[PDB]
Design a protein around this ligand. Sequence first.
Ligand SMILES: Nc1ccc(F)cn1
Length: 330
Amino acid sequence: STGSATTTPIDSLDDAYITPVQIGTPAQTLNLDFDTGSSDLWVFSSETTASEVDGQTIYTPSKSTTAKLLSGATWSISYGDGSSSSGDVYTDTVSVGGLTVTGQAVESAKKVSSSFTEDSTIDGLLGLAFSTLNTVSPTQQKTFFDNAKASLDSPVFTADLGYHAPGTYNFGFIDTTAYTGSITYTAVSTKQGFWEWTSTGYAVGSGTFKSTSIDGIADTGTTLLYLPATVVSAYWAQVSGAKSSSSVGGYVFPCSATLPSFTFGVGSARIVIPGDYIDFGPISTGSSSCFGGIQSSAGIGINIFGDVALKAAFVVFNGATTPTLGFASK
Ligand SMILES: Nc1ccc(F)cn1
């Protein structure tokens, strides 16, 4: 089997991407944030604290004839941005663009943190990292990809995020028309539960490529590109007026700037992120100071190849016996 669904940026800045997901019987369509940096499929629901829902579409398990309460199961998760959610669990039929999983754990939110409430465009998350990170207790649950894997024509999913435009998530196949050149595969470590790999280096604009190992994760659920301070300082030193602002929480630059590109290495291959992809607009409404899309990972503990990097490439998340990651230009 295969699945194919369009992913859409939630706003004019590509702050996140939403993909419609069908849950239950009859189908209840919710727009979820496909996240390769987490492993829980959770949704806003009829059980979510009333004051914590503000415009989101909710899943109502009592209206689904295939929903079953997973007895005694609870979940609680915290993300890198300080956000969190928790609640109870149902098993139900979940479909993504024609691909169906019966008995998928659907984590119903009883509580969500302010950032989730404040974002009316995201109805929940669909985790695509390794099932070892799943927070369901006392019986850990599998991801949608992990449940569908054996049924897929090929044990893979692909992320093709658009810049200011819709893109696609495919399951079970590689669309050879969606990229240019060839796909370069690179080794993955699953020890931390992430699609963790090692970039072979970088370049800033038309500058010389620096061969240096950068361990990091391919994460569709993180908006920006988080890299070591030395690399990020080399990037922003090419932009007149750019500086690290402690009050803003990162590198800012004059909105009047035309940004240079950023290249990252995948083996001997090179992925070029165009400069416009690194512009995240005014720091506050009407400001002429803009927020940078490449930020330091110094406070995180890990480098993150978020949407800024992934949207420049066609990315293969290969769930073969030994998982690997594939990157191609597009
Ligand atoms: N880096 C993040 C932040 C929030 C979220 F829901 C997922 N990933």
